[PDB]
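Hi support team,

I'm opening this ticket because the web form for multi-chain structure prediction keeps timing out on my end. I have pasted the exact lines I submitted so you can reproduce it. The total is 1497 residues across five entries, so I didn't expect it to be a heavy job. Is there a limit I'm missing, or should I split the entries? Thanks in advance, R.K.
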Amino acid sequence: TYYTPDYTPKDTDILAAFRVTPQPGVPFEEAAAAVAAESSTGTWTTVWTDLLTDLDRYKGRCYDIEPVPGEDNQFIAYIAYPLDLFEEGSITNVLTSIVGNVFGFKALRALRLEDIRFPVAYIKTFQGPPHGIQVERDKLNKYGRPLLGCTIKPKLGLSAKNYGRAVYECLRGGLDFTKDDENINSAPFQRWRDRFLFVADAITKAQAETGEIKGHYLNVTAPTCEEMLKRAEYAKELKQPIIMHDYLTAGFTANTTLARWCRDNGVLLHIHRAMHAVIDRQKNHGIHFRVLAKALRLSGGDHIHTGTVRGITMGFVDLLRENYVEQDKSRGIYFTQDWASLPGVMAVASGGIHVWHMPALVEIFGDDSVLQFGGGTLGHPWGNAPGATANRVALEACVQARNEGRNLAREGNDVIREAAKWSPELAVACELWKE
Amino acid sequence: TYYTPDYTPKDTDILAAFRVTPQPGVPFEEAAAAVAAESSTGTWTTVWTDLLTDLDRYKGRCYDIEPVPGEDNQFIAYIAYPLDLFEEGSITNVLTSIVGNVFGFKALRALRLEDIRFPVAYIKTFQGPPHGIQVERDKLNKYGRPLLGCTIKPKLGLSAKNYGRAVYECLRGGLDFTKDDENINSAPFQRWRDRFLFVADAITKAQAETGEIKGHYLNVTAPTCEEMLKRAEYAKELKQPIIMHDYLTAGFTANTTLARWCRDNGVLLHIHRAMHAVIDRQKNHGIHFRVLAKALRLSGGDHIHTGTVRGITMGFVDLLRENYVEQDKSRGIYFTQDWASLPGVMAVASGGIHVWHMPALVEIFGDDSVLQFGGGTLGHPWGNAPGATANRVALEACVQARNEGRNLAREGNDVIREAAKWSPELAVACELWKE
Amino acid sequence: TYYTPDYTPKDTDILAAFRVTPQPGVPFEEAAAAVAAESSTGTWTTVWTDLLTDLDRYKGRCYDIEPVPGEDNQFIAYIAYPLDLFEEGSITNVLTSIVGNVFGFKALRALRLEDIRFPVAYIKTFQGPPHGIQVERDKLNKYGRPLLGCTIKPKLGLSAKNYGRAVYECLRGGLDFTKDDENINSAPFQRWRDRFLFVADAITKAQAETGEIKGHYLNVTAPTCEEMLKRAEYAKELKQPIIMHDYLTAGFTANTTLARWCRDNGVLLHIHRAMHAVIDRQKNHGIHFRVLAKALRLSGGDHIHTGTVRGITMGFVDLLRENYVEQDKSRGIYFTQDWASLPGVMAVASGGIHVWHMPALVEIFGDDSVLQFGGGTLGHPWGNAPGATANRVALEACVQARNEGRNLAREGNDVIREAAKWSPELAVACELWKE
Amino acid sequence: LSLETQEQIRQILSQGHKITFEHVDARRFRTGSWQSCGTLHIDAESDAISTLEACLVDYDGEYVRMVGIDPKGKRRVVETIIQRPN
Amino acid sequence: MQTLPKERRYETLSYLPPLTDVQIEKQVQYILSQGYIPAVEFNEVSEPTELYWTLWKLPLFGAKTSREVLAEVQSCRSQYPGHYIRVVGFDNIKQCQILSFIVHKP
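Hello R.K., no limit was hit. The queue was backed up. Here is the completed structure from your submission:
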């Protein structure tokens, strides 16, 4: 009474794709009816209270089973959940109802949520991104090109003043942004309020110098919800265009009250994807990143870490930027998702890239993305200021070559070496980070 | 410079046990130095900024490698982290620093955190449980015996009034508590405020009837942090002794601001372990439940779901109740944990148990635990009120037999059948749920 | 049952050193067991309620007796107190439990607390200093040298405007700081709000003149806790880097709410040690200053008055600045104190010093201290501005001589006199304050 | 090598514990930042007295101290300063 | 090692050597090829705070070849020699500017 194949999904309904590995001697029908039941109005026994409420209308049910090719006791399950049973404008409930305790079931060894479709009716209740891509470019006055960020190294050690100067030299060369590390909060060695005051002196300095709008992501992530709002009251007070938060670690409810506040005040929020690798790593167990990416877009967020490069990564990148995306099973997308005019989230590329990966990342990610160099700028032979001008000239070279109409897959190593002739700073960096 | 075997752990230091499965052709020393590095002040390249800060003092290092018996490329890693580098009174940071992105490393296929030791110095910064076991028994005036809870079925379907009556008949028979399901939040069919008002009428009714203190866990879990606090303002207003929350799904930061509030107001909090089965299921990959149980005790919580039965389950049960627990490798405990006078959390046993599992669960869990019957009370032939008196008389029979000095492993089936002679309600239930 | 010599102290335990003088005819064992009892779970009679609680675990006990050399009925008592019985992050409780009413006991004529050791576990609960030395130098941009302060004389008499001008001339010459007197609060002749406004005009004036960061300690000490916070709201509003407080007279709880507020707002706090001389004067009776200095470091405070010079004073000076300090009985230190990364407090030297004590005070106190001239700057033949330039050139001469590698004990009078040749302002001051 | 030194050496190795000796110059003693010198986890008296005279001489004008290490997990039991700077 | 000199920079394509009138023609050819609407903007002073420049004539809705945009560039260069001038490209489907680069300095 949970497994019903004949059922045809409605438009106002949330649909999910589960990769199921049952215990041997367990049929393909019963283990499918058990996760469809245990997520929504499911109980191990028949109880008398089920005859007063209408169970047929509310119940989630499995309508389609597809066996995974070249895999034994491995098949894809399609379950449909009526729209009414979830609360309005809360990721916390949709997360809680579906993927609650269907995991760690005795009937099955391994379980993995692959994808999740949102009907448009449900999409409307949320705020979504406080700004989006189109809005964000307009506040910063930057067009044509991918935006350039920088992570200060080392992660923990520097004083509040030393942090303030290491940030000053980087934006001076010609970086758009600078970034705080994901584990710096209110460490004893540098308190947050001191770090917040010295970074304020270095942005105004390099702003009046180069003559461009500069920024720095001020990590706001705090243990309690008072502290978080109170730290943010101070960033608004020093006229900071951007701050940043880790959503997975603080929780969805922490991330929610923030985004409402951020739309209230017109500050752009960066989101780091800290602690992602423990859930989405295993191909048999966990939840796929694309589910969490949607959940982020809906919670709200102007930027998001996507990870560096392939067929799978462009699946959930075009899923966060485009208004309408089509079902493509090879890419990794199981359902047709339609966003109701909701603004797009900008892709952030960070983690071990130098001036030779420069042709590869402008072509794949395109124009609406942020390129972030942790080790690639500071570790320049000549310091932070020459290391910045190195990465700036190398981006602008590939963007000019692309417009005129050159393939950057073919002439990728060619444009970097021409540019290396008239600029001294790129000649010493081409030498160091070789092939 | 990360792998140092000669090192001897200090007392003010956090120690961790990782079960490591490297890629073939990867030595046992390098993959151990890579997770010790990548969790704390670790970078793929040598950077110049490392010479200004003192790297030797802050770095986490591997001091002991133990190969797993009967397993190839499988060994246990012991890493020590200095105390200073974590922020004070926040699970969010300790979770973020250690098990951040050491998972999904290319050098290794499978990784599992087994255990985590807290030095006493770090333990003091937290609030911990808002009350604890000793405090909780004193507010409810219940001694000698395990406490009896009830989960209303079905999970989603009933109206606010029908819910109010199905709860009234259960506490009338002689249950201590009634419980909301983990996926009911603010569903369209019953809004939270209506459910909160009818449950208030049925507790006062059965309180003035039987002449005992009765309760019901009011699920507070909400999408945003305003809504959560605002719903709780209403439960305090109707003079409710208990509410409940799902900590994994809402996040640790959501669960934190709540517990501070709950100690502020003197309401007992139940915690459901929804969505546990996806992380702790696999013996090669994830984090063991005992790590998350500690993290809960420290975050705070008066009750916690432990799961029904064995050598492993009594490991983390005596770990949550006792003030001092000794290292036992067969039980599953790797380190000597010492709690600094921090109150204990009460064990909650729920998931598919009837009146014949009654002798087995009083002996193993002992006296300081809550026994919860989802399907076992409602599905009684005679209804909710006789189904409650059935489970009440069967507990009190085993508790009397235990005191006099009878083994409940030997005379377990004997005490249930003697009691079945003078009470009609247990005679019809002994019949139904057989062997 | 209180005197147990066999006992070996644990690490998570607070230990105390008492200098005891019993009444004649009182053994050395009973008067030691009486102060160990009367401070913690001690009563003159056996009561029945002691058989319900576990007395053995909670009780403080004397483990070692050392007779004082060359003294009759005078000996050092060592008592150990379990960690659990004190409340967390409150000096108020530790002061209350120990040195409550063990003083004024009929069994003993005189009693003196010499020292007090804090286990690291207890130290972590406190905020401690809002900034510390390293943090404080970074906000003011002053390196190499001791910092120079000035006390305006007379103590009570001047109008709000006359105070404003007498502060202007001093910082103009080249003092770092100016200071309010310990008895100026809200006197009828100059109201605080008027004094707070005129000092704001004179700092901005001398800041734009000499081209350095200047400061003035604004005494905030107020009768009630509303007034104190409300006066401080005004100091933050005029962008004042420093204020100051008297901690002994206002009490520890007043000083506490302040320090929390000060870390919240990023203002540096000076602490005057007014009313110290009545407790710590007598060598037979009272509490030693080193106990109160510890108590200050933990309460919080960026500066502290240490008093002018010797073997005793350097004992509690290296105790407030250093991270780790070793047991030295000759110096006056009884226990091994270990601070858990807690920032250091800067020494303040004030009370009757001139330009000839200049060589002696740079060598003994070192580099991280504040030298303050009350009578030495104003009482210059030529006024406040030349009197400032006199003390400035005399400090910079001794700091340059020290670096090159000259002993300031042998060549101390020599460097002051060869500086007197090229500056006219030091030649008239060398004349006046002679030998 | 005093009489207090060899009794503690014998008391450490009579427990089944291993000895580690550590030195520090006066500057890094502030922050309690000591280091290992010679051979670690020493399990006999003559290896202890030989590398004690190696380290008294190798780092003369520094602090030197002896550690008693329980080989079970490498847990620090007993710490005692032998040599102090002049 | 070399120290980086202080330079006042001008948004996109300013770290590359000043553009030749052929490099100008290729970048506007890309605007008309993708189907976006090229336009000319001028301002007296260049600052990070101001985000609206004075618009030159109208956006050229009927632009077939890249030479018609170059002739509008030289006529504004002739009219205002002591002005900052830049060429932008409006998109009509996504409602946002794709390209913004500075051609003449006062």
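A quick check on our side: The helical segments of chain D are 3-13, 45-58. Let us know if the file doesn't open in your viewer.
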